[PDB]
Structure formats: structure tokens, C-alpha cells
Design a protein around this ligand. Structure first.
Ligand SMILES: OC[C@H]1O[C@@H](O[C@H]2[C@H](O)[C@@H](O)[C@@H](O)O[C@@H]2CO)[C@H](O)[C@@H](O)[C@H]1O
Ligand SMILES: OC[C@H]1O[C@@H](O[C@H]2[C@H](O)[C@@H](O)[C@@H](O)O[C@@H]2CO)[C@H](O)[C@@H](O)[C@H]1O
Lengths: 133, 132
């Protein structure tokens, strides 16, 4: 079952989102979104989208209904049927995505961090824990 | 132990991840954020789980003198058992996470830019020390 939780005060630099779970053996894609929260179909400071089906991990933002320029991570550090741990570390300059034991990609901010009011984790993924530190 | 230099220091949003095991005969181990490799160097953070006295002590040290100790709530470590600690450097302090829970927040005494070395030692067997 997905995760959706409010960050009504916003997230500050040095906020750490730790997500642990398992990629199902038949997974296509899942996502981690940091959103405006006002509703859904609204602005995304971070859309982190591992796609097992097309063998890519896409990063993007969305403002006023329009996607920005996609960034892609190096390789796919996820595997169908295998557990994973992701850290998303909010800094002053961007989001550091850590998967497993290594920094995976650094996504510089497009929206101010103060615009993040909701965390959503969904799609083809089984969640063990979503913690905000 | 683990002892590694930080060329450019640590910046806010640095995450230090430590995985290992407390040996069955442990007394104490520590995680230090120090200004340098020399003896008695200043410590921005001294994080000291003490199995022998059933406490977790945090402190700083400047010009040879320890500051006022802080103690964490309970001892989330046990002899013979593995552990995972996160130390998260922010602009306001060091957040210590043990297992699945925020454990203690240690507000900065020394400037963060003075941290140039990370040391993990004492009665601990390490699986991983990673800086993110
Ligand atoms: O940018 C992330 C979004 O991508 C959308 O599809 C992209 C696709 O990744 C790209 O190859 C090309 O076809 O442009 C499409 C539209 O931007 C997804 O539909 C959406 O879910 C996001 O993942
Ligand atoms: O503040 C950390 C240092 O504690 C020293 O031991 C203290 C002890 O915590 C206190 O209860 C009292 O007995 O004074 C002792 C000496 O200052 C340790 O010796 C030192 O290694 C640090 O951990």
C-alpha cells in the first residue's frame, strides 16, 4: 500500500527521507514525489521514477502542470525481486539520491525547498518503511 | 578503527552512516568528528555509547577541555548485536539516528568547517562507514 504524508511546515535543508522496501518481481515502475500538497496534479519539486520496464531512472520537477527537463541517473540500481534502501537528502542546492551504498545522483533544485509540503511513494513497490529524519 | 580525512570539511546535509556490531564483551565505543589526527584535538562531536555504564554520552572538546555532557534517552545498543547509526550534519547541529528512530539532536558548539576528520573506534566491529 502506498505512502502519502504531509510536511505542513515544509522540509529544511538536511532533511533525510529514508525509504526501504522491495521491488516486486514483476514491477514496471515506482515513484517518490515531493509535492506542493495543495492537491494532486500540482507542482513537484522532485519526481524520482525508477522504471524497471524501460531500464532508466528519471528525475524531474513539475510546475503549473508542466514537466521540466528530465535528468537520468547512471544505470538502474534496482532489481525486480530485490530489497532496496533509498536516501533522499535535501540540501541547500538540491536532492542527493543515495541507493544502497553509494550516492546515485544529485538533482539540483528547480522549486524552492519551502514549496515541498507532501511526500508520496507509490507504484510498483512494496514498502517496509518511509522515515523522515 | 575507521579514521578518514575530510578534505573540504563537512557541509550541512552531510550524512554519516555507520553499520557494525557491538562485540559481546564491549565496554564503550565512539564516533568522533574532530579537527585533526593529533592527540587531544578539538572535537565538534564526540558520540560515545557506553555499555559499561549504560549511557550514551555526547560532548564537544575545545582547547583540551570537554564541554557540558549531554546524554541520550536509553541505550539503543546491546552487546553482541548489530546496529546502524546515522549522524546528520545540519546548520543547527548533529542529528543522531539509531535504527529506525531519531535518538538525539546535538546542537553545534564548534563551527562545522573545523571538522576535518571522522573517527570510529573503541569496542566496535565495523561493517560500513559511509559519508553521503
Ligand atoms: O519526466 C517524467 C515523466 O515522463 C513521462 O513520460 C515522458 C517519457 O519519460 C519520455 O521518454 C518522453 O516520452 O516524454 C514523456 C512525457 O514527458 C511520464 O508519462 C510521467 O509519468 C513522468 O515519469
Ligand atoms: O564527556 C565525554 C568524556 O567522558 C569522560 O569520562 C567522564 C565521565 O563521563 C563523567 O561521568 C565523569 O566521571 O568525568 C569523566 C572524566 O571527565 C571520558 O573519560 C572521556 O573519554 C569522554 O568520553
Amino acid at each position: 500500500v502506498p505512502h502519502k504524508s504531509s510536511l505542513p511546515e515544509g522540509i529544511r535543508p538536511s532533511t533525510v527521507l529514508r525509504i526501504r522496501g522491495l521491488v516486486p518481481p514483476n514491477a514496471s515502475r515506482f515513484h517518490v514525489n515531493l509535492l506542493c500538497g495543495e492537491e494532486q496534479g500540482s507542482d513537484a519539486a522532485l519526481h524520482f521514477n525508477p522504471r524497471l520496464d524501460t531500464s532508466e531512472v528519471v528525475f524531474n520537477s513539475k510546475e503549473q502542470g508542466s514537466w521540466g527537463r528530465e535528468e537520468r541517473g547512471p544505470g538502474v540500481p534496482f532489481q525486480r525481486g530485490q530489497p532496496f534502501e533509498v536516501l533522499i537528502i535535501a540540501s541547500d542546492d538540491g536532492f542527493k539520491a543515495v541507493v544502497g551504498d553509494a550516492q546515485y545522483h544529485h538533482f539540483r533544485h528547480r522549486l524552492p525547498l519551502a514549496r515541498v509540503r507532501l511526500v508520496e511513494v507509490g507504484g510498483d513497490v512494496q514498502l517496509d518503511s518511509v522515515r523522515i529524519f
